Amino acid sequence: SNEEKLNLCRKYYLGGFAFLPFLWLVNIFWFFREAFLVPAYTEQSQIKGYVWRSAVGFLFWVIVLTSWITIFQIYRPRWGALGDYLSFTIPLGTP
Amino acid sequence: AKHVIMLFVPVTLCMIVVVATIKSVRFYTHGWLIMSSLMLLFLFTYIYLGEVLKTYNVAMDYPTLLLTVWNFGAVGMVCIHWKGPLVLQQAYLIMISALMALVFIKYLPEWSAWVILGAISVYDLGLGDFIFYSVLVGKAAATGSGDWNTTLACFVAILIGLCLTLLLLAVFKKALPALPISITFGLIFYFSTDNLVRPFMDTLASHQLYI
Amino acid sequence: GAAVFFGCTFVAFGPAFALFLITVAGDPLRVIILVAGAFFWLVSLLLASVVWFILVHVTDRSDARLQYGLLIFGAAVSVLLQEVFRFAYYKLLKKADEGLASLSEDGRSPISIRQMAYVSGLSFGIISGVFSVINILADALGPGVVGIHGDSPYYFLTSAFLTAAIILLHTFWGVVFFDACERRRYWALGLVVGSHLLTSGLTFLNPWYEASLLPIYAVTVSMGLWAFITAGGSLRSIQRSLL
Amino acid sequence: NSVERKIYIPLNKTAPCVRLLNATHQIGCQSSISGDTGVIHVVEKEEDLQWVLTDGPNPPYMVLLESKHFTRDLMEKLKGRTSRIAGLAVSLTKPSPASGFSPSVQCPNDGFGVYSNSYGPEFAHCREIQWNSLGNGLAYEDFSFPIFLLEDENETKVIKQCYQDHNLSQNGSAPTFPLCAMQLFSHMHAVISTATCMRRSSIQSTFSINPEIVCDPLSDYNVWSMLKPINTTGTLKPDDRVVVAATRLDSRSFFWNVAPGAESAVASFVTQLAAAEALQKAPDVTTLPRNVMFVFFQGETFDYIGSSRMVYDMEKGKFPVQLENVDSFVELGQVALRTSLELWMHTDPVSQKNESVRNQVEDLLATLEKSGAGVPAVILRRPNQSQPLPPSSLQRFLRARNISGVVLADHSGAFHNKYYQSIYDTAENINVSYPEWLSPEEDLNFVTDTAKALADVATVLGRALYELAGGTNFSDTVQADPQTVTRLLYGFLIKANNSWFQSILRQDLRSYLGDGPLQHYIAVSSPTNTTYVVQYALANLTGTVVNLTREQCQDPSKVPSENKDLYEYSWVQGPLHSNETDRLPRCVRSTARLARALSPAFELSQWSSTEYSTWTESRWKDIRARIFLIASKELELITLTVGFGILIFSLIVTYCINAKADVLFIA
């Protein structure tokens, strides 16, 4: 149906506030051809916004994470002991 | 016809993940439902992601891996136990089967792991069939020297028993065990190409011969 | 390194990946025919290796020339067993064509017989090329090449070009073999097994690449022309197909 | 595989350069992960360096040297230009370099002795005498490329033959692109210092499953014994007196497991073992007013591991001999050469500013001269100037108590050893050579002139310790025989798999005796070959046999005699009875105990320390070497181009036949 479509999309969008950007990614991938191609639903109004603000929310995690990963990969040998206490794996030969 | 390839494609991808792990990592050389799925989508993803990062010698911090594993185990828990996309439904069931089959390769002895498989087939799709198909091929790509002939002859043997089991229920039309036909052709063909065809290939390959 | 690996892989599995990707992977029924052909080739290789194992452990591994003679005899009996189980797979497909058509399907033709010839030949080709070259391709990822003990440095490339020719020869031999088995023509049935014996024997001159690689591609071109005219093609059909 | 045998020839008899770590620096060598690959070019002159540094068409080379060109200057030239040198294989020269070679520093064990800016500042950084005058410091540098030692001549001939086959240059042109190459694997898991490495090894062993330990402290056991047995479960009385005879037990070199150490280590503890077995055979040994402790320190090269651990355990009450009980101290240094029958007596000048300490040291030297007046083949001398003390184990004891100590040595100024801490300090350095018509069982019992030279020093040392222990009556019976000296020299320098080492060790320890000589490096392996062989040699040379069965020998508690707190018991193998294999095992009732030698900066867990020798060894995996041919990048681009072309042409032809298959194949 379509009543349990938006009522399942909002449970994907309200679940990405628990540090889940991949839930927002599968919200974008799955509910895209049902929100921008065919105008048929009365409840098509809010299926077009829940996939738009969740693409704003997913791109927000891209800007933070790809900055933090490069900042860690550069500033890890410059940091001293602290770069070792918050490193999951440390490469062997290189400092 | 279509429903046979719908059982070939999941059992092919589950073996590609295991064989690419055995040949590259070199380390493996609702109370009962949800709780025993939190111990695989979080406790085994934490080990499998961490062991493949050691192979390539790359630095990863805790706040990214704790963000990555949580974005794998929570979406995996909300796609299996609750509604989700079908392409993502089957893909996680491939991924949890390969992780559950890789712990049946490391923590077993050499001649003892064939005992379990043997007995199982002797007294024998569902998630149980994806595991023990993958254990057979991962065990074949581990014991011995470098021999890609033995790994890829056990890949064909499972796909034949999976083909004949679906063909056997065209007359009977009843739930079958599926295991004791593919594992029987796996127990034969592993011990028949590892030491009987493998010397015949090496003499032909030393003089560069082609049959 | 990576360049030699990804160069010799695309020579050996260049035609075979193209045929599987464009022709076979669409129909869900042809993949079953492919895996069954690979299975019967595995059974042929196993039954051929049993005889060589028994001979090499009866003759006690004493003389050096007698081991070479047993090697030649094992290659010959392996060729003969491959060409026997090809006929076995033809008989199984002919038995399974009367059951798939006109008894479990209304329309009497879900798949023709020339297509099963093509897919059986390609299945033999793919599994024989996998057992020919995949162990050689793993050594191409190292830094070194062959020739520290006075060998040729063109080992990997020539193994790739031999594997590709073996794949194409099996793909052509399947078509010619099944059309020979249909029309009860047995002079061509000897020519297919004779060409298999010939292309297996020409790899006994194999360190001399000038005469062990060019007659194999000569046989490959002639067998491709005969599998083309065998399946129904002609110059009347080529030159009136360019609209 | 049958194809990799056509590609690679492994290199079998090699020895790598290994990274070791300090509190502030790293030393040693390292490769990249998955090895370093280079084109072989041999070097026999100074024009062959220009081919590697400037004139090479194929820039990442991997050069091959004779070890007479392994000089500090050529290492500076290879280190200044690092992007063109990846690898270095050094070949062992059998005519040893006549100018000498020592890769250690100009002044060994610098900031871990007594002399500093607060105690002896005129003698602080050995301002008077450079002890290792031929030292060029090369073993304490850091290299970015591997350095392997080639020990076999046949492998060097194979590499040079492949060079002559493939890598030459005809008529002043480029070499033809199928070229021979070599790949060296030595990847070290450790980093900047031992603080970083110990921290990184403690984090991964606490916060991480499957712990990645990437260092190991250098550690072994000291081996000591008593002349008269002590209680060992308590401490001695404050009015007990011991006389300590100490000697180092180890050595190193530039390359990892190679450490022959003949002049610097082996002859010194061989002559202390001979002096111990000479002193034990005195008829008045039980009624001596004082006692004698023989001690063999291990770790003395890496800034006094064992001696500092002994002093630290001795001043924390954890050792049964206390530091107050030490009365006299006779250190035994390098005594092997003795160029004019002279044995110099080195003393410490700064502690002798105290008047009673000076009187005790003068009385010690008078006792030494009185006990050496009975041996005409040893001329005991003392240095003319008030010169400082050589680097020795007495310098750790002089940081705590100012004991009256002396150091015996063959030198007055710099070392007579031309090969201090080097690969050439073998049995030919101290002239332990045997005639060729003797069986190796008869070479065990042939007496070298070096054995007769060292037995005299052992006799002087034994009579001196007998006089320091208040003996004074049976002073003529104490005399070392050269038989035990030549057996110990043959065992430690020629062949460890004797008929005499087998009959003194245990059944469990028979794999510690290889076919060649023992190497004397303090390994990560917590007991070493050498520590066991010295312990059981001291057990036979000082202990007696008792009638006990093996069940009584493993547990001597139920025996009414044969106390366990005083002695130690071992069930050893025996000699062979003829025409069968009859080891005849028995108990040895000796005092040869072991004490742990791990430096106290590792027990106190201060891995950035300036007084307790924070030396660690990197952990690694897969040390191997191999030679092969390489193909040009032209051929690699040609085979990748042909692969892409065959793939694209196959896809185009397949799609053009498949799309028109309705028209091409009519019925």
Ligand SMILES: *[C@@H]1O[C@H](CO)[C@@H](O[C@@H]2O[C@H](CO)[C@@H](O[C@@H]3O[C@H](CO[C@@H]4O[C@H](CO)[C@@H](O)[C@H](O)[C@@H]4O)[C@@H](O)[C@H](O[C@@H]4O[C@H](CO)[C@@H](O)[C@H](O)[C@@H]4O)[C@@H]3O)[C@H](O)[C@H]2NC(C)=O)[C@H](O)[C@H]1NC(C)=O
């Ligand atoms: C851990 O282990 C490492 C490995 O050995 C130790 O590193 C060594 O530490 C030594 C400390 O004394 C270093 O020696 C000093 O080097 C200084 C730098 O000199 C340069 O080197 C060349 C070499 O020929 C000299 O000609 C030039 O002058 C350069 O400047 C020297 O300044 C210093 O010599 C001084 O001389 C003046 C003269 O009046 C004295 O007043 C002064 O007291 C001092 O003697 C000295 O030679 C050594 O280079 C260094 N090795 C390496 C490879 O870096 C660590 O110290 C160890 N860490 C510990 C024990 O905590």
Ligand SMILES: *[C@@H]1O[C@H](CO)[C@@H](O[C@@H]2O[C@H](CO)[C@@H](O)[C@H](O)[C@H]2NC(C)=O)[C@H](O)[C@H]1NC(C)=O
């Ligand atoms: C190092 O030892 C290996 C043995 O493992 C040697 O390899 C053998 O070499 C001989 C002579 O060429 C061959 O007949 C054998 O077939 C080789 N055995 C193998 C490859 O397993 C190797 O030659 C030695 N390397 C050197 C430099 O002497």
Ligand SMILES: *[C@@H]1O[C@H](CO)[C@@H](O[C@@H]2O[C@H](CO)[C@@H](O)[C@H](O)[C@H]2NC(C)=O)[C@H](O)[C@H]1NC(C)=O
């Ligand atoms: C060892 O002897 C030296 C010299 O006799 C002692 O050094 C003296 O220490 C006292 C007080 O600590 C001061 O008079 C001077 O610092 C030193 N006098 C000198 C050098 O003439 C040293 O304390 C003694 N003990 C130890 C443990 O080293």
Ligand SMILES: *[C@@H]1O[C@H](CO)[C@@H](O[C@@H]2O[C@H](CO)[C@@H](O)[C@H](O)[C@H]2NC(C)=O)[C@H](O)[C@H]1NC(C)=O
């Ligand atoms: C020191 O002892 C070790 C331990 O027994 C010896 O190592 C063994 O050496 C033999 C002979 O090469 C090998 O077959 C064993 O595999 C080695 N065992 C281990 C655990 O490494 C070593 O040879 C001894 N050192 C010397 C110089 O004799």
Ligand SMILES: *[C@@H]1O[C@H](CO)[C@@H](O[C@@H]2O[C@H](CO)[C@@H](O)[C@H](O)[C@H]2NC(C)=O)[C@H](O)[C@H]1NC(C)=O
């Ligand atoms: C040390 O020497 C003993 C003999 O003195 C060696 O023992 C022999 O080893 C060979 C080879 O394995 C056996 O065939 C003999 O039976 C052994 N016993 C004898 C001759 O009595 C031992 O292998 C040597 N150890 C090393 C490391 O070389």
Ligand SMILES: *[C@@H]1O[C@H](CO)[C@@H](O[C@@H]2O[C@H](CO)[C@@H](O)[C@H](O)[C@H]2NC(C)=O)[C@H](O)[C@H]1NC(C)=O
């Ligand atoms: C130390 O080892 C040597 C090994 O030869 C022992 O010498 C032999 O000992 C037996 C008694 O067990 C005597 O019968 C032989 O005559 C001795 N051979 C000699 C002296 O060449 C020696 O006894 C051992 N030391 C002790 C104290 O038992």
Ligand SMILES: CC(C)CCC[C@@H](C)[C@H]1CC[C@H]2[C@@H]3CC=C4C[C@@H](O)CC[C@]4(C)[C@H]3CC[C@]12C
């Ligand atoms: C061992 C190999 C190399 C032998 C090759 C023999 C070749 C040249 C021979 C033998 C079989 C022959 C074919 C047999 C039958 C036909 C069908 C006919 O309507 C046209 C000619 C054609 C197509 C022949 C062409 C020539 C041919 C392909």
Ligand SMILES: CC(C)CCC[C@@H](C)[C@H]1CC[C@H]2[C@@H]3CC=C4C[C@@H](O)CC[C@]4(C)[C@H]3CC[C@]12C
């Ligand atoms: C390698 C050394 C020891 C022996 C060399 C023997 C050579 C000259 C012999 C032995 C095997 C022989 C081959 C055996 C079988 C065939 C197939 C036949 O249809 C054509 C001749 C051909 C191809 C032979 C050519 C000559 C041959 C290659």
Ligand SMILES: CC(C)CCC[C@@H](C)[C@H]1CC[C@H]2[C@@H]3CC=C4C[C@@H](O)CC[C@]4(C)[C@H]3CC[C@]12C
């Ligand atoms: C060094 C000279 C004097 C003698 C040896 C010449 C060798 C290296 C040459 C001469 C003939 C050559 C072959 C000729 C034809 C082919 C077929 C082609 O598809 C791949 C390369 C290959 C297989 C060549 C490889 C190299 C080759 C074998």
Ligand SMILES: *[C@@H]1O[C@H](CO)[C@@H](O)[C@H](O)[C@H]1NC(C)=O
């Ligand atoms: C080196 O080769 C020669 C000639 O084959 C041989 O006699 C000698 O024993 C070899 N050396 C070693 C250490 O094996």
Ligand SMILES: *[C@@H]1O[C@H](CO)[C@@H](O)[C@H](O)[C@H]1NC(C)=O
């Ligand atoms: C010291 O020796 C006595 C013997 O009188 C013994 O009883 C005791 O256990 C020993 N050890 C001590 C006091 O630690």
Ligand SMILES: *[C@@H]1O[C@H](CO)[C@@H](O)[C@H](O)[C@H]1NC(C)=O
């Ligand atoms: C000299 O040494 C004796 C004995 O060690 C000690 O009692 C005395 O105090 C020392 N002299 C000085 C000035 O410290």
Ligand SMILES: *[C@@H]1O[C@H](CO)[C@@H](O)[C@H](O)[C@H]1NC(C)=O
């Ligand atoms: C030997 O000398 C000691 C003095 O230390 C003396 O007590 C003892 O009686 C002497 N023995 C003989 C036999 O003269």
Ligand SMILES: *[C@@H]1O[C@H](CO)[C@@H](O)[C@H](O)[C@H]1NC(C)=O
């Ligand atoms: C020594 O022990 C043996 C057996 O253990 C015994 O027969 C013998 O009498 C003992 N000798 C003495 C003197 O106690």
